[PDB]
Design a protein around this ligand. Structure first.
Ligand SMILES: Cn1c(=O)c(-c2c(Cl)cccc2Cl)cc2cnc(Nc3cccc(CO)c3)nc21
Ligand SMILES: CCCCCCCCCCCCCC(=O)O
Length: 449
């Protein structure tokens, strides 16, 4: 029953324990939701995140084994590699089905790993092995059917998200004196949000403070309440709150690269190619699929409200969320002012919002991504937007945008909200979109034309 650490973890919450990647551990038990476990190492005993470690008898211990990663995600991971960079992944839908993804001369080759009647694994029928590791080791020395050898495991660059800072049940409150406030973020577009350092861990964070005469208190507290319940890799994560006395604080993880809109407008388009844009759009759809299933609506989905972290990780800002049984409608009080270009027709006309109006906004966000941040509805005056949309006018396909991506945009922009796809359908559509050629290849066909 031994485990090995897959990522480094530094102790700071006094009941937590520091571990080093590759070190062995004995697990004693789990916390209330299984997300943390009490472990013993040669250095001590304490709580560590459960997914930062794995059984010594598990495939995850191998640097090249990335588990449940999709074909498209694999192409993103390997976009930063070289000839011979590779990884082994498993199908999320159908467990047990694995494939090798390998980079060679700027292209990624995908190979299904076959299993014989006696359980042996192989890519080439002439070379079968008892275990996955033996198969990889064999192809690490001779290509034997593959375009080239498997030489460089794709790095696992991102530590798994930890939903909070403690293994204990509800321990959100923290000491304001342990927070050093720094400069405001976003030039004020997000309100009173500042970069800060959480001394106790010398950890950089984002802090929203309830200064007098700004946000209404009930609103601020509801936001804090909602955020305690949100747990998804692509939604900004809450780390703590200071609600014992003013100024109230909401403290979250810090996204280092700012918002997606600015990132796309200022990026190196060589580095941030179509496979990277697809990777980011997919992450956003995953976050929205979660809100959809958890009965929340966003109402402000746009690239300026998506934040970018390391290795193109993208998280949707989750301030302002509203609780709404998925299928019901939320009505805004007349007079509410909305960002017209991202607002669905039923919202513009009747102030009605639902997860379907978020689907419409996602379509506009997808167009912003595909254009590297262009302002929507170019060549059109806002006063005529609703009228034009009613006549079935929709933005034109962005230069180089693959046809299937634009069709998804058009599905999101169906006039009747019930005709639009769900976020579950949208996420699944991205994952199955380029199965017989890469997005890179499709962009080519679109341009060459
Ligand atoms: C702008 N903003 C927020 O509003 C929240 C946040 C908070 Cl503090 C409370 C509740 C909900 C959210 Cl989304 C979290 C957050 C985290 N990271 C960042 N990073 C960021 C934003 C703009 C510019 C830069 C570059 O210095 C870096 N910006 C963030
Ligand atoms: C999910 C997002 C996928 C959309 C990707 C669109 C990529 C467009 C690339 C445009 C090609 C550059 C043309 C040019 O400037 O000469």
């Amino acid at each position: 029953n031994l485990f090995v650490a897959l990522y480094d973890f530094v102790a700071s919450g006094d009941n937590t324990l520091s571990i080093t990647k590759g070190e062995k551990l004995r697990v004693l038990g789990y916390n209330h939701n299984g997300e943390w476990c009490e472990a013993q190492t040669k250095n001590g005993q304490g709580w560590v995140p459960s997914n930062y470690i794995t059984p010594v008898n598990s495939l995850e211990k191998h640097s090249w084994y990335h588990g449940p990663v999709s074909r498209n995600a694999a192409e993103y991971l390997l976009s930063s590699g070289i000839n011979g960079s590779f990884l082994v992944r498993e199908s999320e839908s159908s467990p047990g089905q694995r494939s090798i993804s390998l980079r060679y001369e700027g292209r990624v080759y995908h190979y299904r790993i076959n299993t014989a009647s006696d359980g042996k694994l192989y890519v080439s029928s002439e070379s079968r092995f008892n275990t996955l590791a033996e198969l990889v080791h064999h192809h690490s020395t001779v290509a034997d059917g593959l375009i080239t050898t498997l030489h460089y495991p794709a790095p696992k660059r991102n530590k798994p998200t930890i939903y909070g800072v403690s293994p204990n049940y509800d321990k959100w409150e923290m000491e304001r004196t342990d927070i050093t406030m720094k400069h405001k973020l976003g030039g004020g577009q997000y309100g009173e949000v500042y970069e800060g350092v959480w001394k106790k861990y010398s950890l950089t964070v984002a802090v929203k403070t309830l200064k007098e005469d700004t946000m209404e208190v009930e609103e601020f507290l509801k936001e804090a309440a909602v955020m305690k319940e949100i747990k998804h890799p692509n939604l900004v994560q809450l780390l703590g709150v200071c609600t014992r006395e003013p100024p109230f604080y909401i403290i979250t993880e810090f996204m280092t690269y700012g918002n997606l809109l600015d990132y796309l407008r200022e990026c190196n388009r060589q580095e941030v190619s179509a496979v990277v844009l697809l990777y980011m759009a997919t992450q956003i759809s995953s976050a929205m699929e979660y809100l959809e299933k958890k009965n929340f609506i966003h109402r402000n989905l746009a690239a300026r409200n998506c934040l970018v972290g390391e290795n193109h990780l993208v998280k949707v800002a989750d301030f302002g969320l509203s609780r709404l049984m998925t299928g019901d409608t939320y009505t805004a009080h007349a007079g509410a002012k909305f960002p017209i270009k991202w607002t669905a027709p039923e919202s513009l006309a009747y102030n009605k919002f639902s997860i379907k109006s978020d689907v419409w906004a996602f379509g506009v966000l997808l167009w912003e991504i595909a254009t590297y941040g262009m302002s929507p509805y170019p060549g059109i005056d806002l006063s005529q937007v609703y009228e034009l949309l009613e006549k079935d006018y929709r933005m034109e396909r962005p230069e180089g945008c693959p046809e299937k991506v634009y069709e998804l945009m058009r599905a999101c922009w169906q006039w009747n909200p019930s005709d639009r796809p769900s976020f579950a359908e949208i996420h699944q559509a991205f994952e199955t979109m380029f199965q017989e050629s890469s997005i890179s290849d499709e962009v080519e066909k679109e341009l060459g034309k």
